Amino acid sequence: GLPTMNTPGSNQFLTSDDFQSPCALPNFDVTPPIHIPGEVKNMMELAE
Amino acid sequence: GLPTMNTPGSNQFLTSDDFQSPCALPNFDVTPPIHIPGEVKNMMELAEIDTLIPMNAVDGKVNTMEMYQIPLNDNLSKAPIFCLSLSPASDKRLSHTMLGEILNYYTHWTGSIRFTFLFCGSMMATGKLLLSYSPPGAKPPTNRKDAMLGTHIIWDLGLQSSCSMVAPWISNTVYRRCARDDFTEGGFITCFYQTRIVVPASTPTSMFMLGFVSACPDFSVRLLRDTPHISQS
Amino acid sequence: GLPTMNTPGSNQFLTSDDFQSPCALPNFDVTPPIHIPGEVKNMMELAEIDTLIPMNAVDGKVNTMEMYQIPLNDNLSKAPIFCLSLSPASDKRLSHTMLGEILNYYTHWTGSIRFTFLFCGSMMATGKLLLSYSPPGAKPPTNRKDAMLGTHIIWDLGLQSSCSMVAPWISNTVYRRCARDDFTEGGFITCFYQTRIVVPASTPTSMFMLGFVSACPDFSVRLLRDTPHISQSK
Amino acid sequence: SDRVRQITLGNSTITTQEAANAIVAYGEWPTYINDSEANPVDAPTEPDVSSNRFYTLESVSWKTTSRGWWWKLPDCLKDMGMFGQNMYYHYLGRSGYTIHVQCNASKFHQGALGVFLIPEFVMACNTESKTSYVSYINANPGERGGEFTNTYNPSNSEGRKFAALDYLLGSGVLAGNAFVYPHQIINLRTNNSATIVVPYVNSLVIDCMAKHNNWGIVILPLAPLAFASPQVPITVTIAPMCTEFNGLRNITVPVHQ
Amino acid sequence: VSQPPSTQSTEATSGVNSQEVPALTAVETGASGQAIPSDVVETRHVVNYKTRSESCLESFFGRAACVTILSLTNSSKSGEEKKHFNIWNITYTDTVQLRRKLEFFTYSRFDLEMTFVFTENYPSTASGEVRNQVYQIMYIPPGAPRPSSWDDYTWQSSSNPSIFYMYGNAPPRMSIPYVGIANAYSHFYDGFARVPLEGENTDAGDTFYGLVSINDFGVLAVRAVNRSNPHTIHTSVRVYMKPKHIRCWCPRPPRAVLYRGEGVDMISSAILPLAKVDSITTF
Amino acid sequence: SQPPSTQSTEATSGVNSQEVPALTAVETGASGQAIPSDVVETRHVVNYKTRSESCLESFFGRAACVTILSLTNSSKSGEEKKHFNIWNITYTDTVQLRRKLEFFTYSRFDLEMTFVFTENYPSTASGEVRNQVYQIMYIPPGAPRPSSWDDYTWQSSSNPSIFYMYGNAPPRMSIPYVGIANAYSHFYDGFARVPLEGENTDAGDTFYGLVSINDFGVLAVRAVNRSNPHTIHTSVRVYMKPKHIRCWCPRPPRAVLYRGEGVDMISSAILPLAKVDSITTF
Amino acid sequence: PPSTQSTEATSGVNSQEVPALTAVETGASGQAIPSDVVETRHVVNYKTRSESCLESF
Amino acid sequence: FGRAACVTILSLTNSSKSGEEKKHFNIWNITYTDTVQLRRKLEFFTYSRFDLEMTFVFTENYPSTASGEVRNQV
Amino acid sequence: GAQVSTQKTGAHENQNVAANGSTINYTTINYYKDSASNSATRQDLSQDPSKFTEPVKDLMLKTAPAL
Amino acid sequence: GAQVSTQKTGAHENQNVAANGSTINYTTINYYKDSASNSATRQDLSQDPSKFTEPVKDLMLKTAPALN
Amino acid sequence: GAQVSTQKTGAHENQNVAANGSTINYTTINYYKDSASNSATRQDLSQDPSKFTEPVKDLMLKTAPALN
Ligand SMILES: CCCCCCCCCCCCCC(=O)O
Ligand SMILES: CCCCCCCCCCCCCC(=O)O
């Protein structure tokens, strides 16, 4: 076993937490995207 | 599934640690910097600034503006004008100067200390003063002879009124404690008249001088600590 | 993020651990080193220093200065005049010497041991002593004959006031226990007169010898252990 | 020699015979806002002559019983002619300053005055209950400025005013550490004046003059005005530097007393 | 991989009979004299490898400090719902040691780390069993809606960040980027939020002079997440905060008197920072 | 390369020469130098044994218990002061460690500190008590010390500290060498102050020795949790080891049990050795 | 990264073609910016629209 | 010889009684001979040379009728 | 297999040019077979507001008569 | 995408000039999207006290008469 | 930026030369900025006993009589 140390912040859930996680459905075949008119990239495009 | 082992120290909070931590606001745009004047990089840049010594914290002068005024007289005197113990973070008068206050956040320190004195007398008055520093472990100067024996400088009254003296870094240890210590003391600072102040007619027969203290360029500190000066209920 | 598995031994404290840990005092300036004289790098450097053997263990000479003074007389005698059990750490006479104390921090030891003697009698007196080491598993060296059968030197007293006898590392085991292990018997160190001390008229007829013990260069120790020589209240 | 200096700005000049060289806060000369650092988007007003000229504030008397004087810098100049009009006509603005303080005396006079410039000179409320802060009017003395005291009398006109011991600079700090701020000293024995060049200093590039006092001016006796009571006048004269404004609007008229 | 610079070294220096002597100057100029011992006394050469690492602003302000203590109660009585959660203004004002360090500068710019140390005890002799609880620390930026109770919709936190922590686990931690509006945070504000105009109250400004009216970074909302128990349990959060990646501007004097309140205002009972000495000549 | 081994034995035959490594003089201050190849006929022996466990780093490489502090978290008002415990920084509390450290007059090292916690209900009646977190903080000499467990100084704005939940891995921290000298001294043959003519007729009795000279501040350990109806006795053990260590100027081991922090002896224990019936008794 | 739009310095306009006038009946939004409406100064604008990305929203 | 085997059982007691304080600790001679399956495997050889690793398993109960709160022990 | 990307500018980072130093970069590795397991992707700062603000068949300039 | 930097000197270093080889180094990797998540910055000891102790428009030399 | 070194041998290992097999290899990375946080140093088997056992100003030989 590789020596490690858990720092503060361990075992916590932040709603803005951005990390990797296991797939609930391994190898799931995702429906191909199609072009749909009206693509939005940013909320500011609507602000204008 | 990389095998790992949690070593002691795991799952503890150290207030002085340095670990990475995820941002709670991902991709947040930080207000761009501008060139704000007066940038400080280090606390020592402030340690080198001359501030006044509240030297005259004596009855009737305690906690007032007059506390910073060192009296002078034109009469004969063999007595010291003033005495300080060189303990910049523990002396009652020095722990409150900027040097002392920055230093109150440190445990240990080194380097030389500079003192500057200024005559705020009339232009008409003349004479000379003896500024002197005596290293630790000996009877502190009691008179002018002792003052002449140790390190000293003669400060004449003149147009370049200000005069500095440097208490050189003489120490057994490399660093001294900031804290008052029976073992470690910084020696003594005194001042005596070299000669009587000569005062012309219709000229004040009493004056004041101001004293300042600051860090020398070889000055440093070792470890951050809580200060005793601020408290809270 | 990265999948991991905690193994046995996780979240335990071992006094023998050698792991990194965060500094409680970040960016601290460590007072620069200077060339301090007398550097020691290894405990064996101290093991090799000759120290005195508290040989005179007879009641009344114990825990006093005389404890290190071995009497000699010019009286004719064939008696043994010295008896050590060798175990540097367990022999009551050796366990308190520096070599013995260093070994009381270790479980096992190896290498040859040197015994050095100094004659402190008159300049006028002369004579010869038999210094001998007898390997274990044998009848103790009752007399000079047995001492002669074992490993020995003769110390001819003269200008060179001292001599050294070496008890070579003869052992069945590679290492012996520091502990009083009857299995790893030390052997015997003894001394007999080779000849009566010759003392001319008008000199002392009773004199002292000092003895020293030290490690030889092939000496070493193994596992570290608590020493039984120190204690305290709870 | 360095003792004699002449400062020219706009359409007015100060000539001084005995100045203790000169100070620039932080060694930073005032400049105009760069394109790389700007909030306003409108073309700026740059009234260089009308604003960057010296103006004199009413002088004060130095007595042996004086404990100090103070001003808020843009406040003391807020009604100052054409400069003052631009301050009231625009929402935003920025300026540096040249502050020249002069106090003449005979060679037979003794004493000293320290001049310190404090960014963000926030003063303590006088009243102990601390349930009320200082009103706009009381907080902004105008050209006359205010004064320091030597006693604290926090009675619950007092309720809404600033008060400051000279001793603690109205800030709760010791006055002896005031030297941390850009400063120069007028020692009557050595010089008649002090000159400090002041850059605009804020967390913002530009700000609103009617709301914020970028700097304050603190003048304290350091040594008594001994003479063999005496009185000596102190005059403070100030000019804006690199003045610029943004956000032109109708005239702003503050609450009056 | 360069060697860091040291503090000033000393060159061996002989005594002098110079007619140009650095000992005298004119402090009136606003400039400090610069004498180092070699300018005053005879000195030896000294190799100086000492540094100012511990005094870097990053190191000075590099420690987490307790900034506030919040408390909440998990109980089941008719008058206790309001005590289930705690709403607090974000500020460093609450604790004096950190505030004083920050007050050395007029302006500062930094990122922050927030660390929360949780504890609990029984305020009541019932001493009954309770389950390990989950606590929620939600941040509500200014102008965002606030909860009326601990059990409300705002706790959904769909846009607001929020952290859920279990008691007994490592203290939770998160990073906050500089969020100031200005290009630095101001520690002081010599001004008003608004300008009372001619058509106003004479005392206007009494409710808003100072930083107290412009500094608003929202609140933290802390609640036990767990439904209440028959046995009351009292809990609290010691909030720790640390400056990181910090730079400061425009140094000023440290506070000499007991703080009190939100401004710089002192109290009459604590306006005397120094001790008395019987004499000017006493060592 | 290969870790250097201890001395190998060269083979040798009988010697009838006049070189005499067997005889010497120790009066010179030198130790005897003889080895088996000087004294007896020998065989060649290859020696690969390594003096690694005798390196000073190894010798001092294991953490020792240094101190045990007693804290009690209790609701009784008369026991409130027991909620926290302030200990002087020292290694003089435990004898096994002092014994080894005091072998050298001087040393330089970094220090590893760890803690071990355990708790019980010292009272007659146990009951539900929640998991406590402990706050360990260092208060350097000159730093203010708390008068109470809830004293504002536990803000720890500068003083470094650790918050540990009972039951998680024992806490650990590294401390760099902190001497103000170029080495820690383990001894001090001197006085903090030099009494001068006049003053105190015969001063120094209250300030002789290392015990006066090196003030390392205190370690303050508090419970962080408020009190409970049922109270807890909590024991904290402090463990230490030198790491990255160098030593100078070796000394004899102590024979006498230490009479505390000085070098003082108790009259009841100044007899370190057992007797043997005689010189000639094995 | 891509950034938001900057402001160019401008002066007085006596153009027969005016950007401030339009007709929202077309369904297009008005397109005028401050530099078209008033005289402006040059401004470098780094206030990047990252928080507003759908991925962040 | 690739698997760990149980080699001994030690008994520790936390005692609230005036007696059995001595049961708070247990000193065992190190050996593998308490266990027959392991010694039999080792005894296939006259001589052996190996490094050894040890793992411990702790388990505890409340043996008395008077059950009540006990803090987690170390 | 690790990727290296530039971090969002912090409080005391370099100039807005975002091209100064190696200390502004971060490293990330995907640990799963399913891309749905990846942490959020990088933000796309590309925008095209004309799609909704000027969807006019016949393009017009700002100063052109609207009608 | 790691960086390797030297460490501040400890007790065992006989090189207070940080010149004892590869022996003294540490490795750091940033693991987060924002730099606000990075550990504390590299130490920077550059200083310039003249900003606060001698902010004089006129250059003064230490042996110069302060005023002529 | 990992450093490597020879591991001490064990039961199934090679001779005391420790040169046989690349498999005897302990790998380490320092994770902290202060070297005081690093694990213990490499064994230093350098020895100099003469400082304590033969600090004689004169050149003394073992075969020469100690005295003369
Ligand atoms: C989910 C919890 C998020 C925590 C939000 C804490 C925000 C801290 C920054 C706002 C205060 C800035 C002014 C200051 O430094 O005091
Ligand atoms: C946050 C924990 C910091 C504690 C610092 C206290 C100093 C530890 C060293 C104590 C031993 C000094 C004397 C010696 O090593 O010989």
Author numbering:
A (entry chain o): 1 to 48
B (entry chain k): 1 to 233
C (entry chain g): 1 to 234
D (entry chain j): 10 to 165, 169 to 240, 244 to 272
E (entry chain i): 16 to 298
F (entry chain e): 17 to 298
G (entry chain m): 19 to 75
H (entry chain a): 76 to 149
Question: What text does the study give?
Answer:
For this proof-of-concept study, we selected CV-A21 viral strain responsible for a substantial proportion of enterovirus-associated acute respiratory tract infections in humans.
We resolved two distinct polyclonal antibodies targeting Site-1 and three against Site-2. We next relaxed atomic models into the pAbC1-1, pAbC2-1, and pAbC2-3 cryoEMPEM maps. Given the polyclonal nature of bound antibodies and the inherent lack of sequence information, the variable Fab domains (Fv) were represented as poly-Alanine models. Specific epitope contacts and angle of approach were highly similar for Site-1 antibodies while Site-2 pAbs displayed greater diversity; consistent with nsEM analysis. Site-2 pAbs display high similarity in epitope and angle of approach to 1D5 mAb, and a partial overlap with 18A7 mAb that binds directly on top of the 5-fold symmetry axis. Importantly, all pAbs bind in a manner that does not block the accessibility to the symmetry-related neighboring binding site.
